[PDB]
Design a protein around this ligand. Structure first.
Ligand code: THH
Ligand code: NA
Ligand code: NA
Lengths: 304, 304
């Protein structure tokens, strides 16, 4: 149990945050990521609408089966592409989504196109306010009227978990990431301490623990970051890659994390089954602890 | 990190126990279990020795790959069979092994057949000292001069973790299982709180935690039966069954457990890959917990 009262955000019906076992893990699958075979032109955003819809429908079905809610990680390499991807996602699912790009300018340009749309304020989560945030980024976020952001509380200057306190709150003459986000009008903060490689997932989970223990923000991470590039394991094929991936993806949940970016959506069928199992066992512990489940739509009550 | 000074046993070269990240998880696969198809006659103990040897060779190869040590769970349904299986295991692997039957009469009979033998004393772990123990059984153990036993707190009269601790440590007019084992001359206790079902694997793990917190004995469990009786998930096939399995099997390790009985040895190729991944992440945490690795034969140093 965490000492700070936990923030539980309701993002278009998706509950994120809470004490361990209160709410199911929110699963965040990537679409239109680099090399995604349903994209034929990543600059113009030419993509397979039927295939994308099938992924979204599959996500909805797996979510209905296990009780794990979902937020879509929408990636783009160009303003044109990401704008089109977001338009498609708004139309073809109800889920919140991350506005995501390796390049901040792509996120900024996409926000200008999408505009201060009330639906965008409700369902678009800015991914992310990072160490090297710019003023034009904060201006774009404010002009779009966004209310929820991922705070990527990661730096090579703050490798230790306790150093996330410094990143979020600020230190010396440096504005904290929470302060920066608030200046941009953000009111809900999903804290992601970042993942470098598979092993370092344990440090990321410790950071999540610090953040929940001291501030009560929802904490999560992207364990997929080094898993898909782990060729030694992936080249082994099924089911070796999936069980290795399952070990990585479930680990933060076992230490009280609230959300996981599990990588390409095509992996959802095995990811949901692994994560739901972990959630079930954690929630069963509530019987001893006295923690009450926030919802009846929980893996514990669904997967057996 | 656990409160009590941890007992680390050296079971004929296999280290088991310690603080999280100190030693790799010990993996314990079952051979000659009920319905194991390499067995042509379970009453007489007639089996395909080449197929059995192939399993043992595979275990050694997987162990060499990840750094996870292995102890073989040797099951038998008759005194005749189990005696032959133990003789085979002694000459076809160097590893320690569990003398295992659901029938106490079978364990005791086999053990009597094995006599007083330094190799048996070094390699044979009695599975298990459990609630139905008899003075005959304790005397047979003492006569064999065994030094290590699995202490199994599986009981439908002890569901909650604290009730399992009561079974282990004694309460009221019961000496408890640890005390019973000591009377049999056991000096090393591999504590297995039992797995009642998949969801209650978290209670199993809580019991392991209390054992390590208060006594410092190595703790582990055997979730394979619970996983194989999970019809809903098993019906989904591969790789869904395996990733669910992996979530269950790795969960206790994420909470500091020392060993897992992972079920049939045929499942070793995926179990080792999942467990090694968890071990790698936990050992990476060692700086944060103030733990030192007790060996360089550790997944963190092998699987990347
Ligand atoms: C960087 N990381 C990340 C993070 O750590 N935190 C936030 N908030 N957001 C994000 N967004 C993107 C990413 C998480 N999602 C991912 C992570 C990794 C992959 C991935 O490895 N894709 C593969 C290609 C796909 C494949 O091989 O199947 C690659 O080589 O790039 C795909 C998506
Ligand atoms: Na949760
Ligand atoms: Na094997």
């Amino acid at each position: 149990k965490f000492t700070a009262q936990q923030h539980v955000y309701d993002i278009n019906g998706v509950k994120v945050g809470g004490q361990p076992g209160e709410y199911p893990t929110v699963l965040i699958g990537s679409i239109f990521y680099r090399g995604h075979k349903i994209v034929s032109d990543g600059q113009k955003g030419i993509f397979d609408k039927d295939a994308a819809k099938a992924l979204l429908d599959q996500e909805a079905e797996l979510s209905a089966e296990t009780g794990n809610p979902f937020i879509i990680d929408v990636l783009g390499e160009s303003v044109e592409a990401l704008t089109k991807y977001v338009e498609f996602i708004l139309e073809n699912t109800t889920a919140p989504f991350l506005l995501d790009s390796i390049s901040p300018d792509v996120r900024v340009g996409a926000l200008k196109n999408l505009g201060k749309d009330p639906e965008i304020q409700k369902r678009l989560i800015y991914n992310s306010i990072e160490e090297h945030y710019t003023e034009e980024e904060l201006a774009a976020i404010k002009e779009a009227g966004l209310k929820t952001a991922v705070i990527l509380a990661f730096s090579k200057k703050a490798l230790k978990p306790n150093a996330r306190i410094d990143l979020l709150q600020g230190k010396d003459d440096k504005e904290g990431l929470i302060a920066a986000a608030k200046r941009a009008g953000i009111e809900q903060f999903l804290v992601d301490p970042g993942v470098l490689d598979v092993a370092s997932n344990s440090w990321t989970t410790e950071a999540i623990n610090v953040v929940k223990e001291q501030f009560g923000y929802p904490g999560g991470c992207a364990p997929s970051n080094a898993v898909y590039l782990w060729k030694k394991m992936r080249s082994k094929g099924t089911p070796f890659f999936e069980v290795a991936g399952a070990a990585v993806f479930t680990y933060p949940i076992t230490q009280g994390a609230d959300f996981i970016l599990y990588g390409p959506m095509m992996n959802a069928p095995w990811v949901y089954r692994a994560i739901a199992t972990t959630d079930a066992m954690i929630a069963y512990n509530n019987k001893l602890t006295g923690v009450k489940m926030g919802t009846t739509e929980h893996p514990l009550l669904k997967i057996f």
